[PDB]
């Protein structure tokens, strides 16, 4: 299960271009993959905790929204 | 209006064409108290795209003191032409607003298609519409009484008059902090209470309260200006 490589180098390059980055080093992609993995781990852990507390086997959008809001990353558009 | 805010007999409602340059009404007809009461307790006239200016100022302006009545909107637009002001589209471009070019675009901008046809018939192109006419023909802003162009112009001018004034009351060194706090408690209702014989006066935002006695209070409840901060020792 190696799915962190699913975030390809062109995708990271596109995300950097949206951020105004002109030139990218070759070692940036691994660092970005690690940062994304850490962020997703935290958010998903909080969402799964919220889901278990609700006695459910399905992760809903409200759980993710609450998990993001708990981290000071309020997200608008999903409830 | 009299002390009870009722119509004051005789002549409770006088046509405007009979009050222009008439100081004898101020002198011999009870002074300024009824006039201030009428100003405070009478609704203004709403600006609608089919009701712009009344016929008193449009047909009979300064009728008594002139050989013929004047036309105030016509005078406004003739003065704009005399001053050599640019047209409606130039000022829309100046304020950063879209400039209509056809009758459909002008109708969309004005939100009144029939008014757009009338303006197109009179002028022929939106670039030639006079500044006053285009400004007063625009739909009013929410909680406002001017269009986006007029609001832009007036806001810019008053921002310049405020920031460019050295003796602005909020500027440091003009008034002391205690004096500024004392001045922050003033109100036109309090001035009217102090300087006239009117004892019942509209509440806060005197420019909004217009119906007696729903938005009127007693003059004694208004806080007074405390001048003790002006004492020099």
């Amino acid at each position: 299960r190696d799915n962190i490589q699913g975030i390809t180098k062109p995708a990271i390059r596109r995300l950097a271009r949206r951020g105004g980055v002109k030139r990218i080093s070759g070692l940036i992609y691994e660092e970005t993959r690690g940062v994304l993995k850490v962020f997703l781990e935290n958010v998903i852990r909080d969402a799964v905790t919220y889901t278990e507390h609700a006695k459910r086997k399905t992760v809903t959008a409200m759980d993710v929204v609450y998990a993001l809001k708990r981290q000071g990353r309020t997200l608008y558009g999903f409830g | 209006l009299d002390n009870r805010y009722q119509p004051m007999e005789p002549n409770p409602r006088v046509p405007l064409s009979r009050v222009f340059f008439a100081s004898w009404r101020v002198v011999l007809e009870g002074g300024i108290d009824p006039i201030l009461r009428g100003l405070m307790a009478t609704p203004a006239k709403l600006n609608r795209q089919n009701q712009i200016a009344v016929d008193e100022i449009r047909e009979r302006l300064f009728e008594q003191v002139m050989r013929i009545g004047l036309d105030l909107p016509a005078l406004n637009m003739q003065r704009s032409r005399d001053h050599g002001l640019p047209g409606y589209n130039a000022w829309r471009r100046f304020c950063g607003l879209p400039q209509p070019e056809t009758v459909g675009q002008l109708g969309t901008v004005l939100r009144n298609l029939k008014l757009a046809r009338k303006l197109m018939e009179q002028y022929g192109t939106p670039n030639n519409i006079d500044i006053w006419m285009g400004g007063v023909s625009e739909p009013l802003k929410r909680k406002g009484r001017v269009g986006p162009l007029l609001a832009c112009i007036i806001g810019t001018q008053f921002r310049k008059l405020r920031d460019g004034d050295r003796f602005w009351w909020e500027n440091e060194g003009v008034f002391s902090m205690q004096q500024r706090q004392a001045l922050a408690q003033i109100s036109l209702p309090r001035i009217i209470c102090d300087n006239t014989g009117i004892t019942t006066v509209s509440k806060n935002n005197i420019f909004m309260s217009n119906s007696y006695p729903r938005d009127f209070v007693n003059c004694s409840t208004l806080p007074a200006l405390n001048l003790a901060s002006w004492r020099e020792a």
């Binding site: 699913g6 950097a16 030139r23 781990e41 889901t51 809903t60 993710v64 | -």
Partner: protein, 98 residues
């Protein structure tokens, strides 16, 4: 054999992707990664589509902001190339790895 300068197409992409609102990461790989990560907390988990979409939006916004901060850090060091030390410095100052 018309070849652009090594900086023209990068600026063109910067202008193109700063004017759009789409998602820059393919949806299926991100969904697979999210499921793989969630496998570490609770087995036999089901995900709503809106949940995965919200996770993707949050991750993309976070990465874009981090890359803006990283660009600021790189420009501070008199450079135009984005380097991992810039990312580490940005994460420290933000308070993430601090």
């Amino acid at each position: 054999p018309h070849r652009y300068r090594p900086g023209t197409v990068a600026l063109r992409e910067i202008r193109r992707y700063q004017k759009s609102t789409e998602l820059l990461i393919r949806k299926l790989p991100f969904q697979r990664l999210v499921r793989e990560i969630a496998q570490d907390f609770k087995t036999d988990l089901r995900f709503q589509s809106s949940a995965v979409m919200a996770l993707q939006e949050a991750s993309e916004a976070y990465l874009v902001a981090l890359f803006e901060d990283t660009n600021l850090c790189a420009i501070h060091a008199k450079r135009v190339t984005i380097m991992p030390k810039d990312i580490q410095l940005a994460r420290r100052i933000r308070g993430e790895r601090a």
